[PDB]
Every structure is written in structure tokens, then in C-alpha cells.
């Protein structure tokens, strides 16, 4: 969904990538779909029950895992990220595991006169008194 090269100028790229790797015989080029690379990254992060946050923008996505995670949520998030970078790489989707001292693991709310309103994700976090 982001490349606009024709069939004639896709064999030029395959013939030029063949000259870079002298051990190869013919480089096969296939077009992977673009929403499957973000859906597998989202559903694999929901399956481990990890508090995450998705930020969609043009030309790549990102998933942020903030908060005071415990040892099981760190070992499961690090094992899934290292089992995903092998398959798809880090050109499109990037993970953002970071530890801060707030008991709400990423989310934030403000409270007035009707209940709670879910705030937009920002960089500033409220420090947790417990």
C-alpha cells in the first residue's frame, strides 16, 4: 500500500539486488500486506495481557508500554518484542517499553462535574502517591 513501481521496474530492482549478493542465484520479491503487519503486532500484544497504547500516524505505527510493570510483564513483553523483530523488523512498527513510577500503567484521567474524562496520551505523567 505504499509502493508504486511497475512490473518492468521491479525486475530492475531484482537484477540490481542480485549483483550485491554474489552467492544468490535469483532474489524473489513478494509484496506483503500492510495492515497484517500491524494487526499481528496488536493481537500478539493483547494476547499477553499487557497494558499498551497505540499511536497511529502516516508511515509507521508505534506501541508504548509505560508504567510500573512487574517482572512477569517485563519478561513477557521483552520476549514478544524479540520474537517479533525477527519476523518483521523495525522499519514500520516500533515498540517503546519504558518504566516510570506511576501505578496507572500509562493511562490518565481528569475529573470534573460529570465523572471522568479520558485524557489524550502525552509525555507528562502524574507521580503516584501510594
Amino acid at each position: 500500500q505504499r509502493n508504486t513501481m511497475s512490473k518492468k521496474e521491479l525486475e530492475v530492482l531484482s537484477q540490481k539486488l542480485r549483483a550485491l549478493m554474489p552467492y544468490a542465484d535469483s532474489v524473489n520479491i513478494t509484496l506483503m500486506d500492510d495492515v497484517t503487519a500491524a494487526g499481528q503486532a496488536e493481537a500478539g500484544l493483547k494476547q499477553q495481557a499487557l497494558p499498551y497504547s497505540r499511536r497511529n500516524h502516516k508511515g509507521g505505527v508505534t506501541f508504548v508500554i509505560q508504567g510500573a510493570l512487574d517482572d512477569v510483564e517485563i519478561l513477557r513483553a521483552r520476549q514478544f518484542v524479540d520474537s517479533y523483530y525477527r519476523t518483521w523488523g523495525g522499519r514500520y512498527v516500533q515498540f517503546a517499553i519504558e518504566l516510570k513510577d506511576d501505578w496507572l500503567k500509562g493511562r490518565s484521567f481528569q475529573y470534573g462535574a460529570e465523572g471522568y474524562i479520558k485524557m489524550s496520551p502525552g509525555h507528562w505523567y502524574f507521580p503516584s502517591p501510594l
Binding site: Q110, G112, A113, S120, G122
Partner: protein
């Protein structure tokens, strides 16, 4: 250099006096917090898009009483509510209530309980409201 995006007041262990002073611009009147009701604390991120509903909901979750007499907002706590019984002689409750309605001190949360055409009734509320109702009711009998 204050990085937050929206609007609101963030309180980190405030003393319930600087909080209600921060709500004193959205409320267009100054706020007078009492001495015993300023020993409580509050912590969180708040947002005042309309203040008269937040003040009513916070007065019941924290436990407080408050009164607005046209110029300021007096805030007490629940354990300071005082009451009194007053007996008129020549003016009725139905026309003293017209004095409160014409002036602007009528408060529907703390009305006057009593007979409509009589002289004795019962009032209970904040100490700035009771000490006004008693002093004006016993100053209208000597006027008439």
C-alpha cells in the same frame, strides 16, 4: 514550560484552601474556607467546565456545607451546622419569606420549616445563614 495540553488544576496534596482559591476564578466570587474545614486534603487532576455542579458533588463526597450570599461563598464542614427556633409576634412566615425572596437570601437547600400563618419556625444551616435569619427576624418585630 508547563507541559500539559488541556485545561485543569493538578493538586498534589493541597490543603483544601488553595484548591478552592483556584476554583475562585471560574466561580466569579471569592471563596472563604473556614478553619476546621481547611484541615482536610485533596489530590488529583480536576477540570472546571461548570463549577456549581462540581461544588455540589464535592460537598457531599468530602462532607461540607456551603452558602452563597451574593458576594462570596462561605464553606464550612458538616459538624458546624447550627440551628435555632425563633418566635415572631406581628409578622407572618409567609411575608418574612417574601423579604428573603425579594432580597436574595432565599436558599432552597435550607428552607424555613414552620406553619405558614404563625410566628414560630425552625431554621438550620450554615452559621452565616442562621445568624442572619435570627438577627433580621428579631429586628423586624421591633420595626413593626
Amino acid at each position: 514550560k508547563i507541559p500539559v495540553t488541556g485545561s485543569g488544576f493538578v493538586a498534589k496534596d493541597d490543603s483544601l484552601r488553595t484548591f478552592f482559591d483556584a476554583m475562585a476564578l471560574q466561580l466569579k466570587e471569592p471563596v472563604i474556607v473556614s478553619k476546621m474545614a481547611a484541615r482536610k486534603k485533596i489530590t488529583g487532576n480536576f477540570e472546571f467546565h461548570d463549577p456549581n455542579a462540581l461544588l455540589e458533588k464535592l460537598s457531599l463526597q468530602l462532607g461540607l456545607i456551603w452558602y452563597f450570599d451574593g458576594q462570596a461563598i462561605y464553606i464550612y464542614d458538616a459538624s458546624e451546622m447550627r440551628n435555632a427556633v425563633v418566635s415572631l409576634r406581628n409578622v407572618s412566615l409567609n411575608e418574612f419569606n417574601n423579604f428573603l425572596k425579594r432580597s436574595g437570601l432565599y436558599n432552597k437547600n435550607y428552607p424555613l420549616r414552620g406553619d405558614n400563618r404563625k410566628g414560630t419556625f425552625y431554621v438550620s444551616g450554615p452559621p452565616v445563614y442562621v445568624d442572619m435569619v435570627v438577627n433580621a427576624a428579631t429586628m423586624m418585630d421591633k420595626q413593626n
